[PDB]
Design a protein around this motif. Structure first.
Motif, PDB file in Angstrom:
ATOM      1  N   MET A  94      42.103  33.805  43.389  1.00  7.88           N
ATOM      2  CA  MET A  94      41.054  34.529  42.669  1.00  7.88           C
ATOM      3  C   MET A  94      40.102  33.514  42.111  1.00  7.88           C
ATOM      4  SD  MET A  94      43.626  37.217  40.752  1.00  7.88           S
ATOM      5  CE  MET A  94      44.560  35.862  40.018  1.00  7.88           C
ATOM      6  N   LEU A  95      38.793  33.662  42.314  1.00 10.22           N
ATOM      7  CA  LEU A  95      37.830  32.691  41.789  1.00 10.22           C
ATOM      8  C   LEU A  95      37.074  33.250  40.599  1.00 10.22           C
ATOM      9  CD1 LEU A  95      36.071  31.133  45.003  1.00 10.22           C
ATOM     10  CD2 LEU A  95      38.159  30.378  43.732  1.00 10.22           C
ATOM     11  N   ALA A  96      36.680  32.339  39.739  1.00 12.20           N
ATOM     12  CA  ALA A  96      35.821  32.687  38.590  1.00 12.20           C
ATOM     13  C   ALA A  96      34.930  31.516  38.235  1.00 12.20           C
ATOM     14  CB  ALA A  96      36.691  33.016  37.362  1.00 12.20           C
ATOM     15  N   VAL A  97      33.845  31.801  37.518  1.00 10.33           N
ATOM     16  CA  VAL A  97      32.989  30.760  36.992  1.00 10.33           C
ATOM     17  C   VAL A  97      33.621  30.320  35.664  1.00 10.33           C
ATOM     18  CG1 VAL A  97      30.660  30.249  36.172  1.00 10.33           C
ATOM     19  CG2 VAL A  97      31.010  31.788  38.110  1.00 10.33           C
ATOM     20  N   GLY A  98      33.883  29.035  35.580  1.00 12.74           N
ATOM     21  CA  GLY A  98      34.516  28.450  34.406  1.00 12.74           C
ATOM     22  C   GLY A  98      34.835  26.998  34.699  1.00 12.74           C
ATOM     23  N   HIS A  99      34.962  26.202  33.646  1.00  9.53           N
ATOM     24  CA  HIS A  99      35.285  24.810  33.790  1.00  9.53           C
ATOM     25  C   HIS A  99      36.717  24.577  34.207  1.00  9.53           C
ATOM     26  CE1 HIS A  99      35.148  20.567  33.276  1.00  9.53           C
ATOM     27  NE2 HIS A  99      36.227  20.614  32.489  1.00  9.53           N
ATOM     28  N   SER A 100      36.910  23.616  35.119  1.00  9.78           N
ATOM     29  CA  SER A 100      38.230  23.132  35.482  1.00  9.78           C
ATOM     30  C   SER A 100      38.134  21.740  36.082  1.00  9.78           C
ATOM     31  CB  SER A 100      38.980  24.084  36.406  1.00  9.78           C
ATOM     32  OG  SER A 100      38.297  24.199  37.640  1.00  9.78           O
ATOM     33  N   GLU A 101      39.186  20.958  35.855  1.00 11.03           N
ATOM     34  CA  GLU A 101      39.449  19.630  36.381  1.00 11.03           C
ATOM     35  C   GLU A 101      40.874  19.636  36.987  1.00 11.03           C
ATOM     36  OE1 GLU A 101      38.270  16.475  33.560  1.00 11.03           O
ATOM     37  OE2 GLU A 101      36.960  17.983  32.630  1.00 11.03           O
ATOM     38  N   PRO A 102      41.220  18.675  37.880  1.00 10.82           N
ATOM     39  CA  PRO A 102      42.539  18.751  38.565  1.00 10.82           C
ATOM     40  C   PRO A 102      43.765  18.944  37.658  1.00 10.82           C
ATOM     41  CG  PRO A 102      41.145  17.132  39.649  1.00 10.82           C
ATOM     42  CD  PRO A 102      40.375  17.582  38.407  1.00 10.82           C
ATOM     43  N   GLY A 103      43.785  18.248  36.531  1.00 12.52           N
ATOM     44  CA  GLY A 103      44.879  18.366  35.561  1.00 12.52           C
ATOM     45  C   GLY A 103      44.987  19.723  34.870  1.00 12.52           C
ATOM     46  N   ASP A 104      43.976  20.614  35.068  1.00 13.23           N
ATOM     47  CA  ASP A 104      44.034  21.950  34.501  1.00 13.23           C
ATOM     48  C   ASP A 104      44.979  22.888  35.254  1.00 13.23           C
ATOM     49  OD1 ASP A 104      42.378  21.616  32.282  1.00 13.23           O
ATOM     50  OD2 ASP A 104      40.558  21.783  33.544  1.00 13.23           O
ATOM     51  N   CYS A 105      45.465  22.477  36.435  1.00 11.38           N
ATOM     52  CA  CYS A 105      46.369  23.330  37.225  1.00 11.38           C
ATOM     53  C   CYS A 105      47.607  23.668  36.411  1.00 11.38           C
ATOM     54  CB  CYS A 105      46.735  22.674  38.558  1.00 11.38           C
ATOM     55  SG  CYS A 105      45.388  22.637  39.768  1.00 11.38           S
ATOM     56  N   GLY A 106      48.010  24.931  36.445  1.00 17.69           N
ATOM     57  CA  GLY A 106      49.155  25.387  35.661  1.00 17.69           C
ATOM     58  C   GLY A 106      48.770  26.170  34.421  1.00 17.69           C
ATOM     59  N   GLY A 107      47.501  26.065  34.000  1.00 23.06           N
ATOM     60  CA  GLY A 107      47.019  26.856  32.860  1.00 23.06           C
ATOM     61  C   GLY A 107      47.108  28.339  33.177  1.00 23.06           C
ATOM     62  N   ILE A 108      47.587  29.131  32.213  1.00 23.04           N
ATOM     63  CA  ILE A 108      47.765  30.559  32.460  1.00 23.04           C
ATOM     64  C   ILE A 108      46.495  31.377  32.289  1.00 23.04           C
ATOM     65  CG2 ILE A 108      48.856  32.591  31.309  1.00 23.04           C
ATOM     66  CD1 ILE A 108      51.454  30.933  31.060  1.00 23.04           C
ATOM     67  N   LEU A 109      46.320  32.365  33.189  1.00 19.52           N
ATOM     68  CA  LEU A 109      45.274  33.405  33.104  1.00 19.52           C
ATOM     69  C   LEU A 109      46.023  34.678  32.658  1.00 19.52           C
ATOM     70  CD1 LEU A 109      42.459  34.624  33.701  1.00 19.52           C
ATOM     71  CD2 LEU A 109      43.230  35.044  36.065  1.00 19.52           C
ATOM     72  N   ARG A 110      45.549  35.351  31.586  1.00 19.00           N
ATOM     73  CA  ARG A 110      46.194  36.545  31.052  1.00 19.00           C
ATOM     74  C   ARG A 110      45.170  37.633  30.876  1.00 19.00           C
ATOM     75  NH1 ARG A 110      50.875  34.996  28.135  1.00 19.00           N
ATOM     76  NH2 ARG A 110      51.035  37.229  27.703  1.00 19.00           N
ATOM     77  N   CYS A 111      45.626  38.872  31.047  1.00 18.76           N
ATOM     78  CA  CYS A 111      44.826  40.043  30.656  1.00 18.76           C
ATOM     79  C   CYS A 111      45.617  40.784  29.561  1.00 18.76           C
ATOM     80  CB  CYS A 111      44.597  40.948  31.859  1.00 18.76           C
ATOM     81  SG  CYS A 111      46.136  41.658  32.506  1.00 18.76           S
ATOM     82  N   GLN A 112      45.128  41.949  29.104  1.00 21.16           N
ATOM     83  CA  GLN A 112      45.846  42.728  28.080  1.00 21.16           C
ATOM     84  C   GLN A 112      47.245  43.173  28.519  1.00 21.16           C
ATOM     85  OE1 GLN A 112      42.716  46.128  29.089  1.00 21.16           O
ATOM     86  NE2 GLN A 112      44.301  46.994  27.749  1.00 21.16           N
ATOM     87  N   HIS A 113      47.572  43.112  29.817  1.00 22.80           N
ATOM     88  CA  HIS A 113      48.886  43.563  30.300  1.00 22.80           C
ATOM     89  C   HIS A 113      49.914  42.458  30.433  1.00 22.80           C
ATOM     90  CE1 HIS A 113      45.856  46.401  31.992  1.00 22.80           C
ATOM     91  NE2 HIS A 113      46.572  47.258  31.252  1.00 22.80           N
ATOM     92  N   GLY A 114      49.461  41.194  30.408  1.00 21.78           N
ATOM     93  CA  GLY A 114      50.352  40.064  30.551  1.00 21.78           C
ATOM     94  C   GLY A 114      49.774  38.965  31.429  1.00 21.78           C
ATOM     95  N   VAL A 115      50.674  38.130  31.948  1.00 24.83           N
ATOM     96  CA  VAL A 115      50.270  37.016  32.792  1.00 24.83           C
ATOM     97  C   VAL A 115      49.790  37.502  34.151  1.00 24.83           C
ATOM     98  CG1 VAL A 115      51.057  34.910  33.953  1.00 24.83           C
ATOM     99  CG2 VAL A 115      51.790  35.426  31.589  1.00 24.83           C
ATOM    100  N   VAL A 116      48.626  37.025  34.560  1.00 26.88           N
ATOM    101  CA  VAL A 116      48.023  37.352  35.850  1.00 26.88           C
ATOM    102  C   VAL A 116      48.270  36.254  36.920  1.00 26.88           C
ATOM    103  CG1 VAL A 116      45.776  37.730  36.965  1.00 26.88           C
ATOM    104  CG2 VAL A 116      46.243  38.752  34.727  1.00 26.88           C
ATOM    105  N   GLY A 117      48.168  34.997  36.498  1.00 28.84           N
ATOM    106  CA  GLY A 117      48.295  33.888  37.452  1.00 28.84           C
ATOM    107  C   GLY A 117      48.125  32.529  36.803  1.00 28.84           C
ATOM    108  N   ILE A 118      48.047  31.473  37.641  1.00 24.22           N
ATOM    109  CA  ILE A 118      47.903  30.113  37.072  1.00 24.22           C
ATOM    110  C   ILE A 118      46.775  29.370  37.761  1.00 24.22           C
ATOM    111  CG2 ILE A 118      50.259  29.731  36.147  1.00 24.22           C
ATOM    112  CD1 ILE A 118      50.972  28.309  38.768  1.00 24.22           C
ATOM    113  N   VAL A 119      46.074  28.476  37.036  1.00 24.46           N
ATOM    114  CA  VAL A 119      45.012  27.655  37.678  1.00 24.46           C
ATOM    115  C   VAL A 119      45.602  26.870  38.871  1.00 24.46           C
ATOM    116  CG1 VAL A 119      43.394  25.739  37.331  1.00 24.46           C
ATOM    117  CG2 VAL A 119      43.752  27.421  35.476  1.00 24.46           C
ATOM    118  N   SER A 120      44.905  26.900  40.008  1.00 27.83           N
ATOM    119  CA  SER A 120      45.379  26.223  41.212  1.00 27.83           C
ATOM    120  C   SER A 120      44.251  25.420  41.902  1.00 27.83           C
ATOM    121  CB  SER A 120      45.944  27.280  42.160  1.00 27.83           C
ATOM    122  OG  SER A 120      46.338  26.729  43.409  1.00 27.83           O
ATOM    123  N   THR A 121      42.971  25.797  41.706  1.00 27.97           N
ATOM    124  CA  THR A 121      41.854  25.070  42.376  1.00 27.97           C
ATOM    125  C   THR A 121      40.648  25.055  41.400  1.00 27.97           C
ATOM    126  OG1 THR A 121      40.663  26.973  43.450  1.00 27.97           O
ATOM    127  CG2 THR A 121      42.557  26.112  44.669  1.00 27.97           C
ATOM    128  N   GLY A 122      39.602  24.326  41.736  1.00 26.16           N
ATOM    129  CA  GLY A 122      38.372  24.349  40.968  1.00 26.16           C
ATOM    130  C   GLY A 122      37.338  23.389  41.518  1.00 26.16           C
TER     131      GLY A 122
END
Ligand SMILES: CSc1cccc(CC(=O)N2CCC[C@H](C(N)=O)C2)c1
Ligand SMILES: [Zn+2]
Length: 139
Positions: free
Chosen positions: A93-121
Motif C-alpha cells: 500500500m503506498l502513501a505520501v509521507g516521509h520515510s528512510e530505510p531504517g523506518d521499515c517496521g514502523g506500524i500503520l494503524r487505523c481505528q480498528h487496529g494494526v493494518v501493516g508495517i513500513v516496507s518501502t519508500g
C-alpha cells in the motif's frame, strides 16, 4: 526497525528477520517482504479486519506519527536493493509521507487496529506491507 506482536506470533519485515526469527519460523513470503516467527510470551497488539484507506504510521526517522491516505494492497514494482532483486512486491500500500530505510517496521494503524508495517519508500512516498488478510494471526 519494528515488529507486530499478536498472540504467539511476531511479524517483522522479512529483510530484517534475525537468526532467532528464522529458527522459530512460522511463515515467510519474499514477495510480500513479511516473515512471522513464534514467541513464548503473549503479544501486545490487535490486527485490523477492515478496508480502511486512512490511518496513522510511526516514522522513526522523525520520532513522530503521521496521518496518511494509502492505496489498497496491490502488486507494485520495487527496484533492486541489497536484499532483493528488482521484482513486484505484492500486498503493498503506498502513501505520501516521509520515510528512510531504517523506518521499515514502523506500524500503520487505523481505528480498528494494526493494518501493516513500513516496507518501502522514497521521494516523499512510504509503502506498507498489509497484514489484514492474514486471518490466522488471531488464532
Ligand atoms: C530511499 S527512502 C526509503 C524509505 C524506506 C525504505 C527504503 C528501502 C527500500 O525501499 N527497500 C530496501 C529494503 C527492502 C525493501 C523491499 N520491500 O523490497 C526495498 C528506502
Ligand atoms: Zn480500519
Amino acid at each position: 526497525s519494528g515488529a507486530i506482536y499478536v498472540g504467539n506470533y511476531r511479524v517483522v519485515n522479512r529483510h530484517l528477520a534475525t537468526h532467532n526469527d528464522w529458527a522459530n519460523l512460522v511463515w515467510e513470503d519474499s514477495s510480500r517482504d513479511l516473515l512471522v516467527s513464534s514467541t513464548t510470551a503473549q503479544g501486545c497488539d490487535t490486527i485490523a479486519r477492515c478496508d480502511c484507506q486512512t490511518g496513522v504510521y510511526y516514522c522513526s526517522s522523525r520520532r513522530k506519527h503521521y496521518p496518511v491516505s494509502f492505496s489498497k494492497p496491490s502488486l507494485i514494482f520495487v527496484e533492486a536493493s541489497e536484499y532483493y532483486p528488482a521484482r513486484y512486491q505484492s500486498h503493498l500500500m503506498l502513501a505520501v509521507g516521509h520515510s528512510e530505510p531504517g523506518d521499515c517496521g514502523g506500524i500503520l494503524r487505523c481505528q480498528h487496529g494494526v493494518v501493516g508495517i513500513v516496507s518501502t519508500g522514497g521521494n516523499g512516498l512510504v509503502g506498507f506491507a498489509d497484514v489484514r488478510d492474514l486471518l490466522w494471526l488471531d488464532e
